[PDB]
Design a protein around this ligand. Structure first.
Ligand SMILES: Nc1ncnc2c1ncn2[C@@H]1O[C@H](COP(=O)(O)OP(=O)(O)OP(O)(O)=S)[C@@H](O)[C@H]1O
Lengths: 50, 149, 50, 100, 50
C-alpha cells in the first residue's frame, strides 16, 4: 500500500495527508474497528485516478 | 471541458446522443440518472465516521472510468427534487461551476479533487424546473423536433 | 460596464484559450451588439459564452 | 475582523472576490462550500468517544491554513437547509457571533 | 510531543489540559484501542494554530 501511494499521482498535499494516515495505521493493532475505517479510506484514495 | 445541456421534447435523440459523442471521440463513458434523486448525500458522500459511509456518485463514477477526462451524462437534470427531504440541486452548484470545480470536495474524501477535465452533458425536457443559479452555469443547445421530411 | 469588462478581461481570455493569438479581433460596436441583442442578464457568463 | 455577506444576481463576481481579497492582503485563503449541507456534524464534530470521530470543517480549515487570521469564504450560505431533522444554520450562530 | 506542547502557543488552561492528557498517555500500553484516541487528540491539539 505504501508502494501504491508512491506510484499513482498524486498532489503533494494529499500525498502528505495519506502518508500521515498510513503512519497512524501502522502503529495500531489490526482488526480493530478503527483500523478498518483507516484502511477503506486509503483504498479509496489510491483507487481514484490522479 | 464543456458543460452542455440538451433541451427538447421526448423521443428526440438526447440520451442516445451522449454515447455516440463519447464513441466518436474515443473517450470513456458513464451515465448517472438523476431522475427522482432526492437527497444531497448522493452528490457528496458521508463523513467516514458513520458505519456504512462511502463517496457520492461522482467519485464512484470517476473510479469506474479509469481516466481523468471521461464523458459523463447527467440524465434528466430537471426531474430532480428540491423539497423538504433533501436538496441535491444546491449540491450541484459545486460540481458544475466552470471556474471552481477543480477543487470539488466530497464528504468522504476530505481532499479537493479536480473535475475540470470531464465532459459533462446533461439532458432535460424543459428549462423551467431548473434553479436559476444552476441554469446559468450550463450552455444550452436546443433540439427542436422533426418535420415530416 | 459590460463593455469595459468584455474588452479588458473576457475577450483576451477566450482568445488565449482557443489558440488564436492575434489572428482574430472584435471591434467595440461588435461587443455592444453582442451585449444588446444576444443577452438578457445581470452577470457576465452569457457574454463570455458568446 | 469583519464579517460580510455579498448579495447579488447570479453572474456577478461574488465567489471570485475571495482569492482577490486574500491575494491583495498577502493572507492565506480557504474555501468552504455550504449549500445543501444538512449535517450539523459538519460545523462541529463528534465527541471522540465515537469510532471515527474528527472535528468540523472550521477546525479542519484552520489546520490547513497555517495562521490564525486567514480569509475564509463561506460559499452559498443561503442554501443550507433547516427543518426538524438537519439544522446546521443554528450551529453557525456560534461561529459568526461578533463578540462571543 | 512534550516539546511541541510547550513550544507552540498555547493558553494555560489548554496547556494544563494537554499536559495532563499526555501524562495519562505515558501510562497506557503501546497498542491499544485507548491509546490511539489520546494520541490522535494530542496531534489535533498540537497541529491547530495558536
Ligand atoms: N467585474 C468583473 N471583472 C472581471 N471579471 C468579472 C467581473 N464580474 C464577474 N467576473 C467574472 O465572472 C465570472 C463569474 O464569477 P462568479 O463569482 O463565479 O459569479 P458568482 O456570482 O459567484 O456565481 P453564483 O451563481 O452567484 S455562485 C468569473 O470568471 C469572474 O472572473
Amino acid at each position: 500500500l505504501r508502494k501504491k501511494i508512491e506510484e499513482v499521482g498524486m498532489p503533494e498535499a494529499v500525498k502528505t495527508k495519506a502518508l500521515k494516515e498510513l503512519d497512524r495505521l501502522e502503529r495500531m493493532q489490526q482488526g480493530s474497528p478503527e483500523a478498518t475505517v483507516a484502511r477503506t479510506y486509503l483504498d479509496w484514495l489510491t483507487e481514484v485516478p490522479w | 471541458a464543456p458543460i452542455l445541456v440538451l433541451v427538447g421534447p421526448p423521443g428526440v435523440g438526447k440520451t442516445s446522443l451522449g454515447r455516440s459523442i463519447a464513441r466518436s471521440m474515443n473517450r470513456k463513458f458513464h451515465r448517472i440518472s438523476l431522475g427522482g434523486v432526492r437527497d444531497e448525500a448522493e452528490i457528496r458522500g458521508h463523513r467516514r465516521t458513520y458505519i456504512g459511509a462511502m463517496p457520492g456518485k461522482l467519485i464512484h463514477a470517476m473510479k469506474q472510468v479509469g481516466v481523468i477526462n471521461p464523458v459523463i451524462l447527467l440524465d434528466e437534470i430537471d426531474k430532480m427534487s428540491s423539497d423538504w427531504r433533501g436538496d441535491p440541486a444546491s449540491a450541484m452548484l459545486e460540481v458544475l461551476d466552470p471556474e471552481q470545480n477543480n477543487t470539488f470536495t466530497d464528504h468522504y474524501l476530505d481532499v479537493p479533487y479536480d473535475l475540470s477535465k470531464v465532459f459533462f452533458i446533461t439532458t432535460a425536457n424543459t428549462l423551467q424546473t431548473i434553479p436559476r443559479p444552476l441554469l446559468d452555469r450550463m450552455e444550452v443547445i436546443e433540439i427542436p423536433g422533426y418535420t415530416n421530411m | 460596464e459590460k463593455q469595459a469588462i468584455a474588452r479588458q478581461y473576457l475577450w483576451p481570455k477566450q482568445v488565449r484559450e482557443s489558440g488564436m493569438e492575434g489572428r482574430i479581433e472584435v471591434t467595440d460596436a461588435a461587443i455592444l451588439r453582442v451585449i444588446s441583442e444576444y443577452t438578457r442578464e445581470a452577470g457576465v457568463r452569457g457574454l463570455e459564452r458568446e
